[PDB]
Amino acid sequence: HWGYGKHNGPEHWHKDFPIAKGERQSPVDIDTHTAKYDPSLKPLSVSYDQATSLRILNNGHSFQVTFDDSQDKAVLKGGPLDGTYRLLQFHFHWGSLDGQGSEHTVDKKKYAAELHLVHWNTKYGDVGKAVQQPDGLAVLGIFLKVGSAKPGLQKVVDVLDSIKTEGKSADFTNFDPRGLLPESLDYWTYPGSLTTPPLAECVTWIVLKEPISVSSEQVLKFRKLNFNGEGEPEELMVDNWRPAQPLKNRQIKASFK
Ligand SMILES: O=C1Nc2c(Cl)cccc2S(=O)(=O)N1
Ligand SMILES: O=C1Nc2c(Cl)cccc2S(=O)(=O)N1
Numbered sequence: 001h002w003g004y005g006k007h008n009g010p011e012h013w014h015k016d017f018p019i020a021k022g023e024r025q026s027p028v029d030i031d032t033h034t035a036k037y038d039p040s041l042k043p044l045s046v047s048y049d050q051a052t053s054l055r056i057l058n059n060g061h062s063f064q065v066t067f068d069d070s071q072d073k074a075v076l077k078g079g080p081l082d083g084t085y086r087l088l089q090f091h092f093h094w095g096s097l098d099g100q101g102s103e104h105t106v107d108k109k110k111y112a113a114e115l116h117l118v119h120w121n122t123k124y125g126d127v128g129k130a131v132q133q134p135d136g137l138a139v140l141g142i143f144l145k146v147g148s149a150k151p152g153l154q155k156v157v158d159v160l161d162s163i164k165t166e167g168k169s170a171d172f173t174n175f176d177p178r179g180l181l182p183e184s185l186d187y188w189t190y191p192g193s194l195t196t197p198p199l200a201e202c203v204t205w206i207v208l209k210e211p212i213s214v215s216s217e218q219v220l221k222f223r224k225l226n227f228n229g230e231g232e233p234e235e236l237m238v239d240n241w242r243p244a245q246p247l248k249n250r251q252i253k254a255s256f257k
């Protein structure tokens with residue numbers, strides 16, 4: 001029932017999901033002058049060499065690439081994290097215009113899109129159990145700006161025609177997510193939530209400072225996806241982002257000076 005339209009969008013979600021007005025909701029605005037460098041943070045460890053991608057799917061709210069998480073193959077460790085977090089999927093949020101689309105903002109600046117690489121804490125055994133824990137998930141968030149093409153994104157964009165409508169999936173094996181990463185792993189981190197229903201407050205957010213550049217042609221392909229299912233009137237999948245939520249009693253920590 002929930003979505004991104006006028007009658008089912010973010011301002012309505014609290015009725016079905018009262019945690020929408022909770023104490024650690026995401027996304028947030030990252031005020032760069034107020035985020036404090038934390039020298040006790042460790043460098044991120046992003047170990048994606050053994051990643052096994054499986055499928056790509058249009059779920060009616062985004063498109064998502066899934067991974068085999070039945071073994072420690074592609075894992076996120078270090079930084080603010082205790083223990084090992086397994087990559088299980090990535091997806092994006094994007095806009096109808098280049099000046100909007102990201103969920104997190106930086107000094108109120110919105111990027112054209114935001115990539116979420118979703119990982120779960122292996123101490124909880126499965127992702128469903130992890131989402132019930134305050135430290136169950138770690139999401140690596142990466143901003144997209146429009147400029148030069150990102151070569152590592154092209155294989156994604158070229159398959160989107162085959163998953164145009166809600167409910168479509170396709171094989172998407174042998175995709176290397178290392179090609180989506182910027183050079184620097186400098187990051188901000190804070191405790192938050194999923195940015196869609198169920199809005200569970202289970203995420204350690206790790207948002208990279210350096211955006212990746214993608215071309216106008218790449219992002220235009222995102223905007224040709226459909227929220228609707230096959231054999232229905234086209235409603236373009238655009239502006240599938242939740243706006244910044246109140247920071248409340250939280251501090252955003254920077255890994256860098
Ligand atoms: O699309 C997804 N939805 C989820 C929900 Cl609703 C709850 C828990 C985990 C997931 S997920 O990250 O596996 N992929
Ligand atoms: O829209 C989002 N939904 C999520 C779900 Cl349902 C599960 C895991 C992580 C996410 S997310 O917060 O990265 N962005």
Ligand SMILES: [Zn+2]
Nearest residue numbers: 091093116195
């Ligand atoms: Zn997301």
